[PDB]
Amino acid sequence: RPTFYRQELNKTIWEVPERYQNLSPVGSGAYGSVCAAFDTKTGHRVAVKKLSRPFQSIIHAKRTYRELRLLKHMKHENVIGLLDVFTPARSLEEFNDVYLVTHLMGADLNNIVKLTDDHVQFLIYQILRGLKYIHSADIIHRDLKPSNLAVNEDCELKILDFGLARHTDDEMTGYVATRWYRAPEIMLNWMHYNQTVDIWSVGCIMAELLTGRTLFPGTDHIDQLKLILRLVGTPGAELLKKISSESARNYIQSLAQMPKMNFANVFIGANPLAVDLLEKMLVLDSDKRITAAQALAHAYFAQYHDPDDEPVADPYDQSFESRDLLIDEWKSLTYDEVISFVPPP
Ligand SMILES: CN1C(=O)C[C@H](C(C)(C)C)N1O
Ligand SMILES: [Cl-]
Ligand SMILES: [Cl-]
Ligand SMILES: [Cl-]
Ligand SMILES: [Cl-]
Ligand SMILES: [Cl-]
Numbered sequence: 001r002p003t004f005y006r007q008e009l010n011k012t013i014w015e016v017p018e019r020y021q022n023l024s025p026v027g028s029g030a031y032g033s034v035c036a037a038f039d040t041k042t043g044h045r046v047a048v049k050k051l052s053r054p055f056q057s058i059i060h061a062k063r064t065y066r067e068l069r070l071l072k073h074m075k076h077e078n079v080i081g082l083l084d085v086f087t088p089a090r091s092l093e094e095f096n097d098v099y100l101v102t103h104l105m106g107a108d109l110n111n112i113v114k115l116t117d118d119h120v121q122f123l124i125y126q127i128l129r130g131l132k133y134i135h136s137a138d139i140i141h142r143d144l145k146p147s148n149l150a151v152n153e154d155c156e157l158k159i160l161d162f163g164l165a166r167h168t169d170d171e172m173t174g175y176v177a178t179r180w181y182r183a184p185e186i187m188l189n190w191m192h193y194n195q196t197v198d199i200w201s202v203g204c205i206m207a208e209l210l211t212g213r214t215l216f217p218g219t220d221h222i223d224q225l226k227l228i229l230r231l232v233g234t235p236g237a238e239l240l241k242k243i244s245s246e247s248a249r250n251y252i253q254s255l256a257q258m259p260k261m262n263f264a265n266v267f268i269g270a271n272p273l274a275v276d277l278l279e280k281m282l283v284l285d286s287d288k289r290i291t292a293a294q295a296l297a298h299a300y301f302a303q304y305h306d307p308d309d310e311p312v313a314d315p316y317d318q319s320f321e322s323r324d325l326l327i328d329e330w331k332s333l334t335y336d337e338v339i340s341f342v343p344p345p
């Protein structure tokens with residue numbers, strides 16, 4: 001066990017191993033507080049996150065276990081990895097606090113956008129390489145957007161901030177970036193969704209890198225649907241049958257029919273290969289969208305594609321997701337995963 005020291009950082013007691021020095025507050029959501037620090041053991045600048053109320057309810061206790069399982073599995077150049085996880089507790093009996101350690105990242109894709117064709121190829125290639133890995137483990141990200149994609153000092157892109165099923169009705173309301181990158185089937189609850197929702201989000205991000213403008217900046221759910229159908233066309237009888245929601249189906253049929261627009265006349269002056277890839281990502285019927293593995297082999301990425309250096313994940317057991325347990329059982333499973341952690345090479 002390392003030695004721990006205590007300090008107060010903005011109304012909060014932080015108890016951390018001596019290796020972590022120069023702690024300074026960076027931010028706080030409602031799921032925890034984050035400090036920047038220097039890790040003297042590795043020489044990395046790191047983000048230390050202290051979870052808030054990790055075991056306060058069955059829903060929260062399971063969310064904590066879900067986030068630690070996910071971060072411990074992800075071992076890929078284009079995905080955030082777990083550098084460390086610790087608790088000052090010496091036993092399960094006194095376990096209350098969980099701290100997660102990851103690489104401090106540089107500029108996100110909002111900061112980058114706010115670019116040549118060569119830069120767009122390079123950045124979308126890395127997102128797709130990381131998504132081929134995530135999807136191979138049957139994980140859906142569910143929240144891809146520019147603020148969840150950042151590059152380090154060497155311009156290596158990493159996917160962060162996986163959807164832990166955490167978004168509130170309020171957070172998705174109105175003129176908000178939290179909704180602009182979502183597939184219509186998840187935005188309006190049309191049907192059981194799958195990993196295809198992440199490729200819709202990649203199409204929206206790629207469009208915004210090419211034009212410097214949000215593709216579907218809707219003022220609310222219905223305004224954003226009208227922007228979407230004006231570009232890709234209203235649904236045919238084949239997709240309407242797959243909308244299992246009867247009243248969602250009824251509303252779509254109230255809209256005047258519109259054809260798919262010419263993407264060369266929308267993305268004026270873009271590489272014709274970029275236009276072709278956008279037409280394959282931005283398809284209303286999710287069964288028909290291009291997959292990450294198929295997109296890596298598209299001619300737009302000829303300069304970067306190497307099928308011997310696009311790895312897949314180890315198998316990932318998510319049987320816990322359908323298990324019903326008490327708060328103290330989720331808390332014991334979480335404690336076991338904290339004490340068994342082995343740091344990267
Ligand atoms: C370090 N780095 C960035 O932050 C973006 C930049 C571009 C590929 C956009 C040029 N890359 O080199
Ligand atoms: Cl230490
Ligand atoms: Cl990492
Ligand atoms: Cl504790
Ligand atoms: Cl964003
Ligand atoms: Cl597993």
Ligand SMILES: [Mg+2]
Nearest residue numbers: 147148160161
């Ligand atoms: Mg985020």
